[PDB]
Design a protein around this ligand. Structure first.
Ligand code: D9L
Length: 361
């Protein structure tokens, strides 16, 4: 075995996905895994439909929205601006966005937004914004700072989509271009992603995986339905492109001749940035404590999980995910389109994949 992987776990992995597709849980599924930067196993299963067209075959290069995985693109963009000297992680947000110059918001720093410790709630409610344009940058900011904060800074890890929308606004301010234009040129094109778009062109729109009508409606829209940018969600991508992003991190910023970050910067992003003893919250409910870097998740890893300590990851509704084990030079990315979450459908295959890892040779 050149990649040193027990290929019977591939059969167990395919059968696990194929069982849920035959039971009606999943419509389709796809994955891709690599050892030492070389993909040795990749499969696509099932069919998809948005409820109108007939069923199309799910493919390995099928484009699909990655949801919260867009946050990793935003994190790279922020850390690039730090490498250039235009941003600092300890910068108070009120320095760039003077609307934050008020009690509570005045102590929110860029480090707090990257690590979900800025005290912001999960999201802004849109029913109270009647009369104001939620997708306007100037309007959305004033409505945010007119809403009370959940906690003060450094009080708890609270996953917030609002936090990364602000980062996309800060990126737009210090660069002179929009967040979408910056990420497209300095990340998407600089890394060589061939099937990654903030907005899918018309000629490729028929090859986008959609499992609901509201996914097809959003497919033809030119802006996020209620955010001034797409820094928290809204990126369409493929398995190979998500695999390239994970491999860029495992190689500490390089993908052969493509360089996105410095070696020392990625080492900072993969370090635990949360104060000890802080409580964790995801969607109001408590969560199990875990490491978290500069926009990168260091949990789950170790403990009862098979993933080695130091494995970094990030999930996204869809569902989707990328998992990279630096100790094993191993990477696993997957697409599991489903309208909600279920760990048996999303996180159980992690036990199957890592149980096949043999000693690298
Ligand atoms: C940090 C953690 O535990 N889960 C984050 C991935 S869940 C997701 O997709 C949130 C919805 C979104 O912002 O698109």
């Amino acid at each position: 075995s050149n990649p040193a992987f027990d290929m019977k776990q591939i059969n167990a992995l395919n059968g696990h996905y194929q069982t849920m597709i035959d039971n009606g849980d999943l419509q389709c599924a796809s994955y891709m895994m690599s050892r030492g930067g070389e993909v040795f196993a990749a499969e696509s299963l099932g069919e998809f439909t948005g409820g109108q067209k007939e069923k199309q075959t799910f493919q390995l290069d099928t484009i699909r929205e990655i949801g919260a995985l867009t946050k990793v693109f935003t994190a790279v963009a922020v850390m690039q601006l730090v490498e250039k000297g235009l941003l600092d992680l300890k910068m108070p947000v009120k320095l760039i966005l003077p609307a934050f110059d008020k009690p509570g918001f005045g102590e929110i720093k860029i480090l707090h937004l990257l690590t979900h410790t800025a005290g912001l709630s999960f999201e802004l409610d849109i029913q109270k914004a009647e009369g104001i344009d939620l997708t306007n940058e100037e309007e959305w900011i004033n409505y945010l700072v007119s809403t009370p904060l959940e906690y003060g800074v450094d009080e708890a890890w609270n996953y917030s989509r609002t936090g990364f929308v602000i980062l996309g606004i800060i990126i737009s301010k210090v660069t002179g271009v929009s967040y979408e234009q910056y990420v497209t040129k300095h990340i998407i094109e600089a890394l060589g992603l061939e099937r990654t778009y903030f907005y899918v062109p018309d000629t490729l729109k028929e090859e986008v995986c959609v499992i609901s009508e509201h996914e097809c409606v959003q497919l033809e829209k030119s802006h996020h339905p209620y955010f001034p940018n797409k820094a928290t969600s809204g990126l369409y991508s493929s398995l190979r492109d998500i695999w390239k992003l994970a491999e860029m991190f495992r190689n500490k910023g390089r993908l052969k001749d493509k360089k996105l970050l410095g070696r020392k910067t990625v080492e900072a992003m993969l370090r635990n940035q949360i104060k000890p003893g802080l409580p964790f919250y995801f969607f109001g409910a408590p969560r199990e404590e875990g490491g978290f870097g500069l926009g990168i998740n260091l949990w789950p890893a170790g403990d009862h999980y098979f993933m080695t300590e130091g494995t970094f990851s990030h999930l996204g509704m869809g569902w989707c995910g990328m998992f990279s084990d630096p100790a094993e030079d191993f990477t696993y990315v997957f697409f599991t389109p489903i309208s909600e979450f279920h760990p048996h459908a999303v996180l159980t295959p992690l036990n199957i994949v890592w149980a096949g890892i043999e000693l690298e040779h």
